[PDB]
């Protein structure tokens, strides 16, 4: 079941005494006339505070349980009250799934690491909240489906616990020989204090238009007239990011589909610039690739550009592909092609026996075998100096301890896989203080019209309704501005059509009241709002749309002036 609260869940927001002062406060309350669940049990959510009322002369409610897991292995709050007094306690418990001579307390079976102790019909109201690690309880016990009235609740405890709460339960006294659960929302009230300093009345500042007038005027009695209380603001829906078609294309073809790759010792570096195209265009014709890209999937880098991209390509044996990766050692990684420890690109390698081996032996591709020192990352060495392993100078002729340092792979088609040739393409991506000239897509998306939307046209960010225009740009202009230099028209990059941008209707909201001493009926005027864009009696005036008043054909003396010859009165 569900019930309707009336004016319940109002508590003293703080200390600080006070006299006859219509004070306005913002805090966590139970909204007036709210939808409160009814229970006669299961774990309930917390989310932000709790209202808890009940009715019964006896005491059926035997404490609460709070916390994040409501189980062991972590600490929780437990509040009980035997016939003595309230007992706050914060330990790590082990709760019965169904907690409940005259012997009792079968709720838990563990109380470890206690960090807090304390010992010491009818309506029993409570307000629970948990802010900055403090668990507050307000309460009041007033003697008499709940009735109808107002009563402010006073602080009960102050508990510096630190506990987090996301769920809670309740405890009931069974028979062996009714309660409410609301939640709190951030609202604003106007509180009336008497001379004794207690709260006697309140206004919920987010309900009826008349209450908004009371709150703006700081009174509970409004005199006849028309009051401006707030405003109407249409809100935009959806976020459409429009963009142009892929300008140019990055010449990856001429890198991967080249007829001849370099030797690894003399690896080839193609620098890429100023070419748009999604980054997942590669790994198409997927299931042969050794695609290994480190620290980022191609999905994530597909929508992240870069200033420059470098394409290094060479040829090695399958056995050695493993060396084309950061932090490896061997002839290739020490002497030919070293990747840095902090590498942020990809390695693509595929087998090319059909292209780079032949029966007589393909001696085209070489690799460096000897070198005095390991390469710094991305270093190239093409010198053909004789490597001096002995202690006699070599003077440039091979001989004893004098080795020409480039050998030759011997690629024949009958080698095993690990001795066959593999072509390798190494992609590096860099970021600098220069504009990023290499990017894939921008996020495809369609285009709607006649709706307040959040739009972006290749950099132009704004909000408004898009409509067909009747302007004519020059054949080089993208967008137009009005007088006072604000954008009012754009051109769609894809379809090349001019669209106007109009603001999404706004205006003041006024409340028309006969006076609280006459009636509580009210009508509302939306200033210069069309009656089709507002969300009975709807009346269109040159001043806006008037809702809640009937328009008659008679003519009276003006009482409450609306505008443009229209007045309102409380007569018929």
């Amino acid at each position, epitope marked *: 079941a569900y019930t309707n609260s009336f004016t319940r869940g109002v508590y003293y927001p703080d200390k600080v005494f006070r006299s006859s002062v219509l004070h306005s406060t913002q805090d966590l309350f139970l909204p007036f006339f709210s939808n409160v669940t009814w229970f006669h049990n299961p774990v309930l959510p917390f989310n932000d505070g709790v209202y808890f009322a009940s009715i019964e002369k006896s005491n059926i409610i035997r404490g609460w349980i709070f916390g994040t897991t409501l189980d062991s292995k972590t600490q929780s709050l437990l509040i009980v009250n035997n016939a003595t007094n309230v007992v706050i306690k914060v330990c790590e418990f082990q709760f019965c799934n169904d907690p409940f001579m005259e012997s009792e307390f079968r709720v838990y079976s563990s109380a470890n690491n206690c960090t807090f102790e304390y010992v010491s019909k009818n309506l029993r109201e409570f307000v629970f909240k948990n802010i900055d690690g403090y668990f507050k309880i307000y309460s009041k016990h007033t003697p008499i489906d709940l009735p109808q009235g107002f009563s402010a609740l006073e602080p009960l405890v102050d508990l510096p616990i630190g506990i987090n709460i996301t769920r809670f339960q309740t405890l009931l006294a069974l028979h062996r020989s009714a309660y409410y659960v609301g939640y709190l929302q951030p609202r604003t009230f106007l509180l009336k204090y008497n001379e004794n300093g207690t709260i006697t009345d309140a206004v919920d500042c987010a309900l009826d238009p008349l209450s908004e007038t009371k709150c703006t005027l700081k009174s509970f009695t409004v005199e006849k007239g028309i009051y401006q209380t707030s405003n109407f603001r249409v809100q935009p829906t959806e976020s459409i990011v429009r963009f142009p078609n892929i300008t140019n294309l990055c010449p990856f073809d001429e890198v991967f589909n080249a007829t001849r790759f370099a030797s690894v010792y003399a690896w080839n570096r193609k620098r890429i610039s100023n070419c748009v195209a999604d980054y*997942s265009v590669l*790994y*198409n014709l*997927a*299931p*042969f*690739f*050794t*695609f*290994k890209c480190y620290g980022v*999937s*191609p*999905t*994530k880098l597909n929508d992240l550009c870069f200033t420059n991209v470098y394409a290094d390509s060479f040829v090695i044996r*399958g*056995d050695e*592909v*493993r*060396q*084309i*990766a*950061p932090g*490896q050692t061997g002839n290739i990684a020490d002497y030919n092609y070293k990747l840095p420890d902090d590498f942020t690109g990809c*390695v693509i*390698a*595929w*087998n090319s026996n059909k292209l780079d081996s032949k029966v007589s032996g393909n001696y085209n591709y070489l690799y460096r075998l000897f070198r005095k020192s390991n390469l710094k990352p991305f270093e190239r060495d093409i010198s053909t100096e004789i490597y001096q392993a002995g202690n006699k100078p070599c003077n440039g002729v091979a001989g004893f301890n004098c080795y020409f340092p480039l050998r030759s792979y011997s690629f024949r088609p009958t080698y*095993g*896989v*690990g001795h066959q040739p*593999y072509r*390798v393409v190494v992609l590096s991506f860099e970021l600098l203080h220069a504009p990023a000239t290499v990017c894939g897509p921008k996020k495809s998306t369609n285009l709607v019209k006649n709706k307040c939307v959040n739009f972006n046209f290749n950099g132009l960010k704004g909000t408004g309704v898009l409509t067909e225009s009747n302007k004519k740009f020059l054949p080089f202009q993208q967008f137009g501005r009005d007088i006072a230099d604000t954008t009012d028209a754009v051109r769609d990059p894809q379809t090349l059509e001019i669209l106007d941008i109009t603001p999404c209707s706004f205006g003041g909201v006024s409340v028309i009241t006969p006076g609280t001493n006459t009636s509580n009926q009210v009508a509302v005027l939306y200033q210069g709002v069309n009656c089709t864009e507002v969300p009975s009696n709807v009346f269109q005036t040159r001043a806006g749309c008037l809702i809640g008043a009937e328009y008659v054909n008679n003519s009276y003396e003006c009482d409450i002036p609306i505008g443009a010859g229209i007045c309102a009165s409380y007569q018929t």
Partner: antibody, heavy 128, light 108 residues
Framework: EVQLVESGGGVVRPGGSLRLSCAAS????????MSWVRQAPGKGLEWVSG????????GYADSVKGRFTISRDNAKNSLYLQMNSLRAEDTALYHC?????????????????????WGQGTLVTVSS | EIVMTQSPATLSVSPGERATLSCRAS??????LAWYQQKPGQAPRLLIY???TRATGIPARFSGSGSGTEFTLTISSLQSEDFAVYYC??????????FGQGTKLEIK
């Protein structure tokens, strides 16, 4: 931590069909290939099928070709094995595995290297 | 298919001693070989990949070696928790990936 949780194992009649599922957590799922491996009671491991990181390349063992179909949902971090025309010889514990990326450019065909993380598996029993 | 043949089928070794397991591929798998440990009622665990690269969090006692067709797993000083079935796997050609028949390591 990387976790792989298999479901959809059970008893099925010969010629029947079953659909295994594996939920993956604790890693970027679209950044890895996935495989199924099975183990019959008291036998060694048999690789069944695998799929690359985007789902654009699949492979199957000769014992299950044309009967089984591997698929993945990257938005759900989930791997599936549709098994049709089941036989008594298909009775096994089925493990889903994340396929590790070998020591760098391993030159391997698809994104499937070696299984690096394994789920505990789900039992499939094919009996009349 | 590439056939992976392990030897011995069973190996009985005392705690503290060195254990060595062999795996032979019927064709060259280059360095595309992994080693796994499987305990009763547990999923297989990767020990070595790339014939010799130790997986993260695997103890230093475990080492792999070999290339082409012949591979070994060595346990330098056997612990009580190392008694298990060990599998080699090739991943050089996809598909199929193939496992060895397993080697049972037991207490002598």
């Amino acid at each position: 931590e990387v976790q792989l949780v298999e479901s959809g194992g059970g008893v099925v009649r010969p010629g029947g069909s079953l659909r295994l599922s594996c939920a993956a957590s604790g890693f970027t799922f679209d950044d890895y290939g996935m495989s199924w491996v099975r183990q019959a009671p008291g036998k060694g491991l048999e690789w069944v099928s695998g799929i690359n990181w985007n789902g654009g390349s699949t492979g199957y063992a000769d014992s299950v070709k044309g009967r089984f179909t591997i698929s993945r949902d990257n938005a759900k971090n989930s791997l599936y094995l549709q098994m049709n025309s089941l036989r008594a010889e298909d009775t096994a514990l089925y493990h889903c595995a994340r396929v590790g990326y070998c020591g760098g450019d391993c030159y391997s065909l698809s994104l499937a290297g070696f299984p690096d993380y394994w789920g505990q598996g789900t039992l499939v029993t094919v009996s009349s | 298919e590439i056939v992976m043949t392990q030897s011995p089928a069973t190996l009985s070794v005392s705690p503290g001693e060195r254990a060595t397991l062999s795996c032979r591929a019927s064709q060259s798998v280059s360095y595309n070989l992994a080693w796994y440990q499987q305990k009763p009622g547990q999923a297989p665990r990767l020990l070595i990949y790339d014939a010799s690269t130790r997986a993260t969090g695997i103890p230093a006692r475990f080492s792999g070696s070999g290339s082409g067709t012949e591979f070994t797993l060595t346990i330098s000083s056997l612990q009580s928790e190392d008694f298990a079935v060990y599998y080699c796997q090739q991943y050089n050609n996809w598909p199929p990936y193939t496992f060895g028949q397993g080697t049972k390591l037991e207490i002598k």
